[PDB]
Design a protein around this ligand. Structure first.
Ligand code: K
Ligand code: K
Lengths: 457, 458
């Protein structure tokens, strides 16, 4: 509906793009492939809306200034903070980022339900396993005519610790939670102005906050002062802001600005505003803050798709729905692991029946004209599956060494303890909760960076 | 290195690098055309760092029907024409190997040719192709290096092969005996060679001059009007600039009697029509033309190539001989490699036959062994096997023990003993090797041969 699912935090388009990229092998390890490919694939098979929408969607997940943790690894010009747009899809290259690899984890293991695509030809997921909490981390900035969400990004470490927090204490209160998730954290750092707007948004669902650029004031040995901006409010166009300020000084609305020069580069942003040796830098800085987009309003609205219905939600509610999602995902995946494991244990019993009547099995195979004849032979003389028989036949002779037979019994017994343990994990919810904690902690310790936005009190 | 062809495969270095690079990247005769830029890039980065100009124009020349007697490169796009228009930029053309150059590369995988390091010791390029048909005589060579200039003209594939076999059978064959087989050159642009004498000097000595001539014949209108029609022109002569030259020659009034000049050349081929007023004999005018323009030209033959990396001027028979020595070397190395392979696989099979033969004992030895290491030294000492064979026995899946599989092993081993036999014999008996070369070369002739285009008038 434009609105993201609460469980994986993806609009239709993003979920499709990702799924295709992962179908077409465009993963984090594998090399890049031309955008045009992932786009046309998606257009044809899952999301029929045009190079326009699909490409721009893909691109947006590649942009470090739009995503707190970019899902799409992009190579080439995927546009910039100054507003220039990306190069044509014939000229770019793309793949899944290391982190989105987590969004797709365990999708093979029967953890999500698939549905038919537009024409009934293929299949797409209805939700990704989404092994780290994507909605709160990366956001939702989609504004449409009926319902327009606007969920700001958050430091990944924070959100994880908060989901864990709600795990251990289901009746946490919004403020107790806020000591873990102190507020948003923009891919372009800033300063958020008040704790109040944040609190209002997390408790209620909707509410407004003030984001603000990071500007210091360097001072020369002769006491001349320069203002230097190194960060801007999430989603302000640097180029348009510079033209704006330049414009005000030209109109004579701000008095005391000498030159305004952009010195940003590979080493980072650096807008430099010069001030007459007379005027008070500070003041000028505040009148900039008030006049331009060096400081702006961000309107939070926590609206998303809860079971196919647009719902506004509180911080605790988002956390909880995500955690329910992980519970299904983990229970199911462990169903899968139980199946797998039981099956391999079956084969192992076979190889043990064999290793235990080795001589007779050997005489029987060597007195068998065909492999087929031998299989039906093993079946009938030892009470085995085709599965097991063919497993015997595929056994290299060095699997008959002492230490290898020991490694078989080792593995089999070990797999017995696993079938039983998995069975239990199905049966007891606390074990499943533990799995989520362990796995989320791995993800935190692998993908966690420092917090970019300093929230001022 | 040196801008001269190697006697064995007949390529300048640059050509040999373009072909090696192409075959290496899978731009073969079957597989789809690739962007020129890709092949030129690979060549410049890897083997021949001397500009996309030289490399791509080299690649272009090998693709033109009118320069190469038997085009080595299958091109696609605008590779030009005999009108002097150059090929279009490498961003605009695609290319691949031609069906005939697949023969230039045959057997290169099988240790038939040595490699050397490339210009920065990061890659390896061959020093010489296998060259399974005589490319130096067939396609020719031209160009200067270390002062000397080489100018070998193209030939008919049928003729050169028939000669190579001729030298194979009769190693004492003489240049006029040899000539009854190879009449003379055969240019891609068809037409006339005038002297049997010129050709003879050229083949017998190494250097010689030959006289090439346009194929012009005098037609007759029902009005008693005459008109010469040129359907063929001499090798390397520019059609455009000759129409030009004749325009000026008649315009300055250097030659008179000429009435009209039209280039009716089209899809059907060349038809240059020149009109004559009834006052003048078209024959005498034709002769003035041969004399004054490029309707008749001098071709300077000089059979200069690289024998062991040294420029030498060879006589026809020495060329044929040097090519035949190369191919003899090649078949010897190839069948040596095939034998290395064979002997190896048959070794392993000998191992497996030993194991199946005493099956029980081997099984029990393995299972009374603690490690694969322990088992390996076990079998080795017990049955006199190699590590290679022992390992191979340990790697044997159990279904290999079925009857049908033991039968398959015995069959492959059989086949293989037969093949090591035949191989060792080909090696020891040079007449067998010569036989191979005759068979293979005659298959190539059977598959690629065409009609002589240049008529040797006497
Ligand atoms: K403002
Ligand atoms: K002349």
């Amino acid at each position: 509906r434009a609105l993201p699912d609460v469980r994986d935090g993806l609009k239709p388009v993003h979920r499709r793009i990702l799924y295709a990229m992962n179908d077409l092998g465009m993963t984090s390890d594998k090399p890049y492939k031309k955008s045009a490919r992932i786009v046309g694939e998606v257009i044809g098979k899952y999301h029929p809306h045009g190079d326009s929408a699909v490409y721009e969607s893909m691109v947006r997940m590649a942009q470090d200034f739009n995503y707190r943790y970019m899902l799409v690894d992009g190579h080439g010009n995927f546009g910039s903070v100054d507003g220039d747009s990306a190069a044509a899809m014939r000229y770019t290259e793309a793949r899944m980022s290391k982190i989105s690899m987590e969004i797709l984890r365990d999708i093979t293991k029967d953890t999500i339900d698939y549905q038919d695509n537009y024409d009934g030809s293929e299949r797409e997921p209805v939700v990704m396993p989404s092994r780290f909490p994507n909605l709160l981390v990366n956001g939702a900035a989609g504004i449409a005519v009926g319902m327009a969400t606007n969920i700001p990004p958050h430091q990944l470490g924070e959100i994880i610790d908060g989901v864990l927090a709600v795990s251990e204490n289901p009746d946490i209160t919004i403020p107790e939670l806020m000591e873990v998730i102190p507020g948003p954290d923009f891919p372009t750092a800033g300063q958020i102005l008040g704790r109040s707007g944040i609190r209002k948004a997390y408790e209620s669902g909707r509410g407004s906050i003030t984001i603000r650029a990071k500007a210091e004031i360097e001072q020369t040995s002769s006491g001349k002062e320069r203002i230097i901006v190194t960060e801007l409010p999430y989603q302000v166009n640097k180029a348009k802001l510079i033209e704006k300020i330049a414009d005000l000084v030209r109109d004579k609305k701000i008095e005391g600005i000498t030159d305004l020069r952009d010195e940003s580069d590979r080493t980072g942003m650096r807008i430099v505003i010069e001030i007459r040796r007379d005027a008070n830098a500070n003041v000028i800085l505040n009148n900039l803050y008030k006049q331009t987009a060096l400081q702006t309003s961000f309107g939070i609205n926590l609206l998303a798709l809860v079971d196919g219905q647009p719902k506004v939600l509180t911080l605790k509610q988002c956390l909880e729905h995500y955690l329910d999602h992980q519970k299904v995902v983990i229970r199911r995946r462990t169903a899968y692991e139980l199946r797998k494991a039981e099956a391999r244990a079956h084969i192992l019993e076979g190889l043990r029946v064999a290793l235990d009547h080795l001589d007779a099995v050997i005489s029987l195979i060597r007195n068998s004209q065909t492999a087929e004849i031998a299989r039906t032979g093993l079946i009938e003389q030892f009470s085995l599956t085709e599965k097991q028989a063919q497993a015997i036949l595929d056994m290299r002779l060095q699997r008959l060494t002492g230490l290898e037979r020991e490694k078989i019994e080792e593995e089999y017994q070990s797999l017995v303890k696993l079938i039983a343990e998995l069975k239990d994990i199905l049966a007891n919810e606390y074990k499943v909760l533990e799995i989520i904690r362990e796995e989320l902690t791995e993800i935190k310790e692998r993908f966690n960076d420092e917090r970019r936005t300093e929230i001022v009190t």
